[PDB]
């Protein structure tokens, strides 16, 4: 077969790259080893975890509702229709713009031709001028951990759970680990989160991390800091983890969420002259182009920031660079978002970086406890913090935690991206929002900032 742009993997990066390329008028093909389109964006990652989290939140609201346990399988059963709808929508998207697909593992043979091998023994060959690599990553699996044990799971096999455990252990304080800890705590299981550092999500703001830790501890998430595993043992009834500090923790299950490794082992990277680091990531430039001129890598496969929306935008920019239609833009200022119960999101500098850089900033706070919308939604916990320059009133950082955090942070991001005097805090006083909504926070927050300035 002959094409112009060939995409590996149908994740957000691959889908975005292929759509931008077909928007340019080229002839484009996509290859994905999964039997269905979507990848970890919909099959094992974002969609199943988010459906589980939303079901857990609804269960929690129902239990605490004055108007009125649940098996894990019943809770997870809400995700199959969502994934079916998403895969149908993406299949229709691909069919309408006429992109041919191949459901098989893709391997490299030269600079222009690839081998697609399916489960039947199918062998096909694709040739194109431009290639996009969006193989993503897989859960990092250390050798000394018996993942074949029925009671030991990773970020993928955890969905195979057939019963809600009495206790559980989570290793790694990453985004996935914290999200799963929050979800399981909502389900009503004593989760023992294990962290290699002293503070949860040290890249976040200190206040937000402290509030998240307080809520997790108040919701049975026993958090142990500064820990490194020594030896994991699987039994008939439970799993026992011996830490290097000497503590032995026994649970009825086990989940590993410490890092991810890029999918490059089966790609045959040596056949083209490219090499991947120990993390399985491919070095790319500001154009998302590797050392090979016609080879482009984008999305989570490159490592940072390993965010599905960020991966989609990175693939879109890589396709724009391939077509050179001015649509390229290096995706660097990604607003971080952690989907625990409740949510967390941030955009821009934190208070620690601002303190280090000696920027004369000021803090405006808005607490969700005194909020009409938050109380009406029965969400008492949460806060919103805005860091703004004292003199120029420019917003240098927005951090929110609580109800609808990710949706709230977008307006602060939009105000942030303005240039010069346009990016000012006083906008929140010169613009009328709706009421009662969560956006009203900004208004209050703005005042709580400008009252601190003399």
Interface residue with ligand FAD among 5, 128, 134, 371 (CB under 6 A) is: 134
Nearer CB in complex with a copy of itself: 65/120: 120
Subset of residues 324 to 383 that bind ligand FAD, contact rule: CB under 6 A: 339
What is d(CA 95, CA 317) in angstroms, rounded to the nearest whole number? 22
**Left (φ > 0), alpha (ψ -120 to 50) or beta: where does 412 sit?**
alpha
Cα separations in angstroms, 298 against 8, 94, 134, 288, 310? 10, 19, 6, 6, 10
* Tokens, residue 56: 């857990």
Is 36 assigned to a binding site?
yes
- Binding residue (CB under 8 A) for a copy of itself from 68, 98, 110, 121: 121
Q: Is residue 105 at the binding interface for ligand FAD, with CB under 6 A as the rule? A: yes
Q: How many angstroms separate the CA atoms of 244 and 246, rounded?
A: 5
Any binding-site annotation on 40?
Answer: yes
Element (H, E) at 60: helix 46-63
Task: Write down the least CB distance from residue 127 to a copy of itself, Å.
Answer: 15
* Residue (of 210, 221, 228) closest to 179 by Cα position: 221
Footprint on residues 296-325 left by ligand FAD (CB under 6 A)? 299-301, 306-309, 311
Among 95, 109, 119, 123, binds a copy of itself (CB under 8 A): 123
Among residues 6, 13, 194, 200, which is the contact residue for ligand FAD, using CB under 6 A?
13
Binding mask 80-109 for a copy of itself (x = CB under 8 A): ------------------------------
Nearest one of 316, 340, 336 to 328, comparing CA atoms: 316
The response to whether 35 counts as a known ligand-binding position is yes
Look at residue 269 and give its three-state secondary structure: helix
Query: Residue 379: CA atoms inside 13 Å, Cβ hemisphere, count?
Result: 21
CA angle at 192 for the pair 190 and 198, rounded to the nearest 5°: 145
Of 119-127, 136-144, 157-165, 246-254, the segment contacting a copy of itself by CB under 8 A is 119-127
| Of residues 252, 194, 190, the one with CA closest to residue 218 | 190
Closest contact distance (angstroms) between CB of 174 and a copy of itself is: 44
What's the CA gap between 191 and 212, in Å, rounded?
A: 15
In whole angstroms, the minimum distance from the beta carbon of 97 to ligand FAD comes to 18
Residue 46: which of a copy of itself, ligand FAD, none does it interact with, CB under 5 to 8 A by kind? Answer: ligand FAD
**Closer to ligand FAD by Cβ: residue 105 or 413:** 105
Residues forming contacts to ligand FAD in the complex (CB under 6 A) are 8-14, 31-34, 39-41, 45-46, 49-50, 105-106, 134-137, 155, 176, 263, 266-267, 299-301, 306-309, 311, 339
Residues forming contacts to a copy of itself in the complex (CB under 8 A) are 120-121, 123-124
């Amino acid at each position: 077969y002959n094409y112009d742009v060939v995409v590996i993997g149908t994740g957000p990066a691959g889908e975005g790259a292929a759509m931008n390329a077909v928007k340019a008028g080229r002839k484009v093909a996509v290859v994905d080893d999964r039997p269905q389109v979507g990848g970890n964006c919909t099959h094992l990652g974002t969609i199943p975890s988010k459906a589980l989290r939303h079901s857990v939140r609804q269960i929690m609201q129902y239990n605490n509702n004055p108007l009125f346990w649940f098996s894990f399988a019943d809770v997870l059963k809400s995700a199959e229709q969502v994934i079916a709808k998403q895969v149908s929508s993406r299949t229709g998207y691909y069919a309408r713009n006429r992109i041919d697909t191949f459901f098989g593992t893709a391997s490299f043979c030269d600079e222009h031709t690839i081998e697609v091998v399916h489960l039947n023994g199918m062998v096909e060959t694709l040739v194109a001028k431009q290639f996009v690599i969006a193989t993503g990553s897989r859960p990092y699996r250390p050798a000394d951990v018996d993942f074949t044990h029925p009671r030991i799971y990773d970020s993928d096999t955890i969905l195979s759970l057939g019963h809600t455990p009495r206790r559980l252990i989570i290793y790694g304080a990453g985004v996935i680990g914290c999200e799963y800890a929050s979800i399981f705590s909502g389900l009503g299981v004593l989760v023992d989160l294990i962290d290699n550092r002293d503070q949860l999500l040290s890249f976040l703001d200190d206040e937000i991390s402290d509030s998240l830790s307080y809520h997790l501890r108040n919701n049975n998430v026993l958090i142990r800091h500064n820990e490194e595993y020594e030896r994991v043992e699987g039994l008939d009834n439970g799993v026992i983890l011996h830490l290097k500090s000497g503590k032995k923790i026994k649970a009825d299950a086990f989940l590993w969420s410490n890092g991810r490794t890029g999918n490059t082992d089966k790609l045959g990277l040596e056949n083209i002259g490219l090499k991947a680091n120990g993390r399985g990531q491919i070095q790319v430039d500001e154009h998302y182009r590797t050392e090979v001129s016609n080879i482009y890598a984008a999305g989570d496969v490159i490592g940072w920031p390993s965010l599905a929306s960020a991966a989609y935008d990175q693939g879109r920019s890589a396709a724009g660079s391939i077509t050179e239609n001015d649509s390229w833009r290096f995706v660097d200022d990604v607003p971080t978002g952690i989907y625990t119960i409740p949510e967390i999101s941030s955009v821009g500098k934190t208070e620690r970086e601002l303190t280090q850089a000696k920027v004369p900033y000021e803090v405006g706070k808005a607490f969700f406890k005194g909020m009409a919308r938050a109380q009406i939604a029965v969400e008492k916990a949460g806060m919103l913090k805005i860091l703004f320059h004292r003199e120029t009133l420019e917003i240098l950082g927005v951090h929110c935690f609580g109800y609808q955090a990710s949706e709230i942070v977008h307006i602060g991001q939009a105000i942030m991206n303005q240039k010069g005097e346009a990016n000012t805090l006083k906008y929140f006083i010169n613009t009328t929002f709706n009421y009662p909504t969560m956006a009203e926070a900004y208004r209050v927050a703005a005042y709580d900032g400008l009252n601190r300035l003399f």
